[PDB]
Amino acid sequence: AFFPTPSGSIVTSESQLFNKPYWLQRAQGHNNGICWGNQLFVTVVDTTRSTN
Amino acid sequence: MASEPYGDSLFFFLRREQMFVRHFFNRAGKLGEAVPDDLYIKGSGNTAVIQSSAFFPTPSGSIVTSESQLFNKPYWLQRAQGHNNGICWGNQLFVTVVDTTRSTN
Amino acid sequence: VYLPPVPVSKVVSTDEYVSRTSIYYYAGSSRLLAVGNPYFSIKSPNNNKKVLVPKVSGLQYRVFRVRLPDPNKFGFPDTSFYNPDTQRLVWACVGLEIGRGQPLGVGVSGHPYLNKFDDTETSNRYPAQPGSDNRECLSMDYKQTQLCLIGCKPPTGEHWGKGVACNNNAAATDCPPLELFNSIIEDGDMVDTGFGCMDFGTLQANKSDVPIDICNSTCKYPDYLKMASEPYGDSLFFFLRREQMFVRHFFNRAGKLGEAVPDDLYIKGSGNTAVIQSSAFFPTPSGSIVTSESQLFNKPYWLQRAQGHNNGICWGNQLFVTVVDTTRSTNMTLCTEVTKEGTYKNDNFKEYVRHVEEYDLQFVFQLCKITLTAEIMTYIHTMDSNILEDWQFGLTPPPSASLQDTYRFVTSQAITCQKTAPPKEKEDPLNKYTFWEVNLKEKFSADLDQFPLGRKFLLQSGL
Amino acid sequence: AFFPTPSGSIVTSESQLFNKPYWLQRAQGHNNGICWGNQLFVTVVDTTRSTNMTLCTEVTKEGTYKNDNFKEYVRHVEEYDLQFVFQLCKITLTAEIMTYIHTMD
Amino acid sequence: VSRTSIYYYAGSSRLLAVGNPYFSIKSPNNNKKVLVPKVSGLQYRVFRVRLPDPNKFGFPDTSFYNPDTQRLVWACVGLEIGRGQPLGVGVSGHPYLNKFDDTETSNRYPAQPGSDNRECLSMDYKQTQLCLIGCKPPTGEHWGKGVACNNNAAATD
Amino acid sequence: EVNLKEKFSADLDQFPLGRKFLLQSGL
């Protein structure tokens, strides 16, 4: 009954994803940016900045 | 498969493989093809019997990134490699996948 | 005053006498293989010349030696492009693909009696351990390397080795000389592995500083400097290379340090430091990960310009492809038992190791015709002689006579015996070596696109 | 008081600066390649090909190993080359320029 | 400096050098000479070419310059440095390096007694390349010892 | 000291660099 233990590599700052603008041009759905009901839900999970 | 005459087992194929060694071991047991004697110099004491000279390494894989995968993207077959330009006779296909980056336990 | 040295004959590239036509011809070998032992060649006990289980590994040069059909003996349907009298025909090379078909996986070997004394990375205390024999069993990897050279003549390596000494010097320590040699690379002579490109046969008495497979063979290395510099260009058309390595541990030798470290450079020691350990460290190369984008193979390789004056043309109807590989050098393990029981003991079983290394080749040629006239026939004879014989058109009186009368005794040999020396041509210098051969006389074709390289070529040229 | 032991890394063969021609088209200083006094001064460092052999001779020959008999020497070698291509320049040496060079050296 | 269209290849012969990689060896009882010279990979190898001066040269046609009032100089327009060997990295060491403890994972302690504690260790180097071309020899820099300032009662010597 | 005193040549295309330079000149 084996189990590994995972570990992250180096976490550089050329492979970051945030702190940049993202202009929507064509979303993959049919809903091309219209937000019915006047809300959005933005979900963000990060792990590069998880110090203790 | 590619050098087949009609060319009907590939339309499209891709691969990525990587591997490096982590440890080295040796086996146990009476060695069959024994070492010749004109290649080294003998001894006595704790060097009485020659130790078994069958080594085998172990593979251990590497980091499994997501910037260099192969799946979840479309693949438009503009011109397949052989002579069948995509046409599938007899109304069947065969896709084979081998993926060992999504193989958690 | 001063004046310009002197005029000398200048070579000329084969753009300007060899003209080319548009008659392309695929060729191609079948799947070559070999199966043998990875470390040492197994010898038969009764007859000690017949090999029983041959030696093949990943690390050797696999120098092939292709053969071609003489393209003057073709019965063409239409001879309309050349008068058969004045012209000749010769094959030119414009394609290549050197496949392989075994999976990845780097291969490891070792010696049973390596010369490890202690570890010199984080702990080597004092005093030294006592003993007379302190050899242990170690394993080590190799440096990953790939290369690929085609050309009309065999490729020439180089290696160090023991050499000629000098006159008497009254304070000269015992130390062997070194000298840079030259050779022609055979099949099976090992490639280097980061221990330098030096012979291990006449330079190591204790026989105990490499793995067993190179303990008595001379690890050459190709000579890119000399082969590029020859003005005819008949030894390289195309060459690729890629290697990497890095150290894994550090190990020091065991023996009398034959040179003494001088007294000036260290504060001398007392107590438990009466003895002074060796400074002879040797590393252990290991190599790194082997991806599948840093390969050099299964990809076509067109030519339009070689790096010399020989723009592809091969005289004498042979090529010489050499490949090295240590990305695909895995070593299997076979276990045939003796008895059939239901309990393990280590003395029932039997372990023979094995190794495979297999290949493939593919070509696509082009037929180009020399116009033979007055200024050209002299020029090829300066280059070689076997070309202007083997087209079976004549023979060359080598002088028009000489100035010296040379004193031919014809009394036939009973007074002051001159060098008689009845000659014989030996028909080649190449016959002494041992090349893997592959025949392509029976395997030409004129219709390309029933083959793999025919469909990749006919898109690349836009035809 | 601490001090760290340095170490190199994976020396490739696609990250080397030798064995390939350059072509100086515009130098960073003022002169574009003129060499007064007819000498150059090239300077090469490398520590990727810093291999170190091990030679080993003997004194007695036997059929049993001991550390006593053999002597070890270390040696090392560095084989080089150079190549150049030069051009030809004429100075129109009038009355001003003879001072322009005399202040230089 | 004007320009013309007369190029001139000038290739050296290949060079070698062979010796000991740590220190030179000098013969006893003379000591002004050396048996095997110290050659290692880490040193600089400052070559120094010489060119034949183009006013004492065999030009096949001296009817492009008027030699009463002109002069000629060479100008480099290409370069290449070949080099041939394997790709092995190298090790050095010191038999009596002043290493006291290890300080990465475990140094639980009372103090350790003794007078000498030196050991034999070995490490490699930072891998480095550079090439540079001049008309004067290149000028380095390094730290060193200096004037002690001889004053103000320096508590740290 | 390397010595290029008498190793020159005026013909470019018989030397391992001289062919690589004649293609870069477009000529």
Curated annotation (Swiss-Prot), chain C:
Disulfide bond among keywords: yes
Any single Gene Ontology cellular-component annotation: host cell nucleus
GO molecular function, one term: structural molecule activity
GO terms, biological process: endocytosis involved in viral entry into host cell; virion attachment to host cell
Keyword Repressor in annotation: no
Major localisation: virion
Gene3D superfamilies: Major capsid L1 (late) superfamily, Papillomavirus (2.60.175.20)
Subcellular localization, as worded in the UniProt entry: Virion; Host nucleus
Keywords tagged on the record: Capsid protein, Disulfide bond, Host nucleus, Host-virus interaction, Late protein, T=7 icosahedral capsid protein, Viral attachment to host cell, Viral penetration into host cytoplasm, Virion, Virus endocytosis by host, Virus entry into host cell
Matches recorded under InterPro entries: Capsid_L1_Papillomavir, Capsid_L1_sf_Papillomavir, dsDNA_vir_gr_I_capsid
Signal sequence, renumbered to the chain: none
SUPFAM superfamilies per UniProt: Group I dsDNA viruses
Quaternary structure note: Self-assembles into homopentamers. The capsid has an icosahedral symmetry and consists of 72 capsomers, with each capsomer being a pentamer of L1. Interacts with the minor capsid protein L2; this interaction is necessary for viral genome encapsidation. Interacts with protein E2; this interaction enhances E2-dependent replication and transcription activation.
Record family assignment: Belongs to the papillomaviridae L1 protein family.
Biological role stated in the UniProt entry: Forms an icosahedral capsid with a T=7 symmetry and a 50 nm diameter. The capsid is composed of 72 pentamers linked to each other by disulfide bonds and associated with L2 proteins. Binds to heparan sulfate proteoglycans on cell surface of basal layer keratinocytes to provide initial virion attachment. This binding mediates a conformational change in the virus capsid that facilitates efficient infection. The virion enters the host cell via endocytosis. During virus trafficking, L1 protein dissociates from the viral DNA and the genomic DNA is released to the host nucleus.
Name under which the protein is recorded: Major capsid protein L1
Lineage start: Viruses, Monodnaviria, Shotokuvirae, Cossaviricota, Papovaviricetes
Chain's gene name: L1
